[PDB]
Amino acid sequence: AERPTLPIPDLLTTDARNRIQLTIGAGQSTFGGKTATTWGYNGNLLGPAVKLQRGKAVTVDIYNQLTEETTLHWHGLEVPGEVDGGPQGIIPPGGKRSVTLNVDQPAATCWFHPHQHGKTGRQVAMGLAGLVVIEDDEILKLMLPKQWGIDDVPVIVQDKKFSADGQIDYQLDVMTAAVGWFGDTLLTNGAIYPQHAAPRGWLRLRLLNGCNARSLNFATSDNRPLYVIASDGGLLPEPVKVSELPVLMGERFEVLVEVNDNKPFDLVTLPVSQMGMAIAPFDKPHPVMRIQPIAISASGALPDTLSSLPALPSLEGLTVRKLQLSMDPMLDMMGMQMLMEKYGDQAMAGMDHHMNHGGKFDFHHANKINGQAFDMNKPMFAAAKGQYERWVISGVGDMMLHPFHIHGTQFRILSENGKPPAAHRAGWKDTVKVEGNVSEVLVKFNHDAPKEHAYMAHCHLLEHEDTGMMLGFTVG
């Protein structure tokens, strides 16, 4: 049979009352011909793309039609803690919460997802994620590819696994608390290996790694390059040509790729050096989507310059914050042993060369920052507002992958896991790799966050977050 077409999320803008309505609910999806219960925003799975303009406010009405509590966080958006939608932003089942977002950051592809305390990994795995497209006056002047669903398309890449009855097989247990929840089935905007028909010329892909725990590495099947034009927080100063593009959980990149008549090619993901993630079929390059060229000219441009990136400021005298990530050694050892027992040596491919003892030994609070599993009631510190700070995040002590994300900001990486950042990672980012080493970022918070609606800083391997690798912090 033919491949399904790539689903395109609807691009949603405000009504005359300046409102956007988002309903959170459960329904059914089909994978490989089997029904599964799934959750979506304005539908059964995934969500729309909310379109925002710098310097304009919009109000979002969010209706929770699940039978459990949830929250809605705008990952990548710089907004006050009161509307950030972290764990304290509870929407009761059957209830509604509204937030007004005063957009004040450059054009970028952001996203939105639940942040329910202890349950973010399950709620994302069940289907909840959406996109945010921020525009400003500067980006439209570039005449980039801009026809949504034609030559400007979002690509949300996620894995799942399913039980024999067809349902999503999600579990937060000792194994996934150590290495993450991952599966054997790859979805692209919710579909299995779709095709996208694109006009001749440049195709813009807005890539999101929406996996709970799997890192990805994008490339093309015939080795045509990808031109990175933007990272998590917006445009790079000029395009950066790459042959492969690693993308950590929750990160976005926008790339341009050439489309030529008569030569279909796949976007693929290459095997990564992360524990568990190279089990067949991910031990080999894995298709993400087929690009099918159409003999109609695409009008978008790849300009030589995209934007102005300010210099880093002097670092001397800035507040230096230390964030030590850690995992309980026993539960790290127990979860890695269960991974190895299940899959064998292949669970470490590509890597470098039982009784109840009480609540003190519960894996649900085994992962930590600065010696503490996440305490919703006690922000760990008060950061300055309007001031640059150097945050130093260490994963020394274990070898798991921790894509570390800080709410309320777009930062600049100074060191990524002990090395200067790659050029396409040197601009605006909201995630930094931490893996067995130390990262340092330059952050500034433009908005307040009080104790009651604090900002989060956390590993975005969701099963680590949910078992304690998160802290709250206030601003102002």
Residue positions forming the annotated binding site for Cu cation: 73, 75, 113, 115, 402, 405, 407, 458-460, 464
75 is a contact residue toward Cu ion (CB under 5 A):
yes
In 10 A of CB 470, how many CB atoms? 28
Residues in 362-421 at the binding interface with Cu ion, rule: CB under 5 A: 402, 407
Output the smallest distance, CB 78 to Cu ion, in A.
10
Output the smallest distance, CB 363 to Cu ion, in A.
14
Output the smallest distance, CB 460 to Cu ion, in A.
6
Pick from 319, 307, 293, 450: nearest CA to 392:
319
429 is a contact residue toward Cu ion (CB under 5 A):
no
Output the smallest distance, CB 359 to Cu ion, in A.
22
Report cis status (omega within 30 of 0) of the bond before 281: yes
Under 8 Å between Cβ of 196 and 152: no
Give whichever of 286 and 407 is closer to Cu ion, judged by the CB atom. Answer: 407
CA–CA dist 203, 216 (Å, integer): 20
250 is a contact residue toward Cu ion (CB under 5 A):
yes
* Residues near Cu ion (CB under 5 A), total: 7
Under 8 Å between Cβ of 183 and 129: no
Give whichever of 254 and 398 is closer to Cu ion, judged by the CB atom. Answer: 398
Q: How do beta strands 381-383 and 470-475 pair?
A: parallel
Output the smallest distance, CB 123 to Cu ion, in A.
12
Under 8 Å between Cβ of 457 and 323: yes
Structure tokens that stand for 469 in this block? 């690798």
CA 418 from centroid of its chain's CA atoms: 22
Give, in degrees to the nearest 5, the angle at Cα 434 between 428 and 440: 55
CA 357 from centroid of its chain's CA atoms: 36
Binding site: what residues are annotated? 73, 75, 113, 115, 402, 405, 407, 458-460, 464
Determine the residue with CB nearest Cu ion: 459
Give whichever of 136 and 463 is closer to Cu ion, judged by the CB atom. Answer: 463
154 residue type, one letter: P
Residues in 434-473 at the binding interface with Cu ion, rule: CB under 5 A: 459, 461, 464
Output the smallest distance, CB 474 to Cu ion, in A.
16
Give whichever of 240 and 339 is closer to Cu ion, judged by the CB atom. Answer: 339
For Cu ion, the binding residues (CB under 5 A) are 75, 250, 402, 407, 459, 461, 464
